[PDB]
Amino acid sequence: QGLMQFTLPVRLCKEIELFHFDIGPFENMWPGIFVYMVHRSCGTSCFELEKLCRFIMSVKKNYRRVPYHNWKHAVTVAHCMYAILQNNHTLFTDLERKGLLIACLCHDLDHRGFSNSYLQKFDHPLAALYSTSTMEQHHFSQTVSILQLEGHNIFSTLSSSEYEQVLEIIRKAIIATDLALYFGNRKQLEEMYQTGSLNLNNQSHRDRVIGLMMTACDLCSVTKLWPVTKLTANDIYAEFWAEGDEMKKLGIQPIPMMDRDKKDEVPQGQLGFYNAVAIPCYTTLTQILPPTEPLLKACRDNLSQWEKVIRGEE
Ligand SMILES: Cc1cccc(Sc2nc(N3CCN(c4ccccn4)CC3)nc3[nH]cnc23)c1
Numbered sequence: 001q002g003l004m005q006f007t008l009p010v011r012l013c014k015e016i017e018l019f020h021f022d023i024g025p026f027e028n029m030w031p032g033i034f035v036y037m038v039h040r041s042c043g044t045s046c047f048e049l050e051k052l053c054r055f056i057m058s059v060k061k062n063y064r065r066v067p068y069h070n071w072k073h074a075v076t077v078a079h080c081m082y083a084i085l086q087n088n089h090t091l092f093t094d095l096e097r098k099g100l101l102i103a104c105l106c107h108d109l110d111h112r113g114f115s116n117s118y119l120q121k122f123d124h125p126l127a128a129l130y131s132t133s134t135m136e137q138h139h140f141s142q143t144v145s146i147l148q149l150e151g152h153n154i155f156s157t158l159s160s161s162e163y164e165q166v167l168e169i170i171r172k173a174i175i176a177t178d179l180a181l182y183f184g185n186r187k188q189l190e191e192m193y194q195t196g197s198l199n200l201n202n203q204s205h206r207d208r209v210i211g212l213m214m215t216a217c218d219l220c221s222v223t224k225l226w227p228v229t230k231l232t233a234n235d236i237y238a239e240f241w242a243e244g245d246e247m248k249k250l251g252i253q254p255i256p257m258m259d260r261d262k263k264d265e266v267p268q269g270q271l272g273f274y275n276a277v278a279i280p281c282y283t284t285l286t287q288i289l290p291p292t293e294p295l296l297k298a299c300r301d302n303l304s305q306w307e308k309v310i311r312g313e314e
Pocket residue numbers: 179221222233236237256257258262263265266267268269270272273
């Protein structure tokens with residue numbers, strides 16, 4: 001370090017502050033985008049540059065060459081969190097700002113392009129090791145492994161106390177990415193918000209709010225400009241349909257979302273997803289963190305584009 005500020009070209013310097021920023025097709029610029037985001041979000045002092053680069057490059061190595069749950073998804077999910085953190089300056093601790101960008105970059109480590117359900121039906125060894133939130137417990141395990149490599153401990157300067165707390169923020173943040181757990185989390189957050197019992201001093205409340213941030217960042221393809229949203233859906237389905245194929249090989253009719261023979265049902269299925277998951281997620285997030293409103297607005301714009309697809313207006 002330490003007078004070594006990372007900088008981005010003008011168009012990226014400006015648009016990286018916006019929720020809808022797409023990190024672009026130059027894979028080699030994504031590490032520098034991430035460090036940029038950490039330095040602005042956290043400080044140039046929060047991590048040793050040399051250790052952080054070595055950490056980022058080992059995380060990159062442990063993402064696989066799958067259509068969707070790949071390195072680009074990691075960095076995309078970290079960028080959405082950066083936008084939330086940067087629009088809610090004073091709401092988060094020093095430990096949270098550190099923990100959360102790392103959690104996001106690590107949240108799908110070593111993903112195989114398959115659901116928890118497929119692992120359980122296949123009888124994968126990971127389904128015996130972790131009976132629920134199977135892949136998410138794996139992702140946390142891989143994060144701790146990489147942190148324990150020589151010269152990769154980016155948290156070396158924290159106390160024993162602060163280190164346990166940061167690894168506990170990261171653990172809960174990664175587990176929250178199990179969508180099966182989002183529905184209950186959001187229903188509790190909506191009841192708390194509306195009875196006026198939400199209290200950001202209650203750690204148990206903070207945990208829930210961070211959980212919803214994680215879902216919101218994880219689903220963020222639905223908050224992009226329509227051409228990004230549409231082209232990302234193709235990647236998401238390329239994985240799901242491959243899973244459907246593997247389900248057919250185990251002798252199981254997959255759900256239509258994973259059946260490439262039911263492509264025609266994609267538009268109507270998107271409407272359900274927006275209405276059942278995405279719109280409620282960003283609505284509750286906006287209630288708790290009003291400056292995240294542009295995520296909800298973008299999502300509502302993308303629901304309207306899928307409505308037009310169904311009407312054959314595209
Ligand atoms: C942005 C995006 C694009 C593709 C997939 C997802 S994840 C996802 N999508 C849905 N939806 C959408 C897909 N939908 C169908 C149905 C028939 C055919 C095609 N699609 C079924 C409900 N339901 C879910 N339940 C748990 N996770 C999901 C997100």
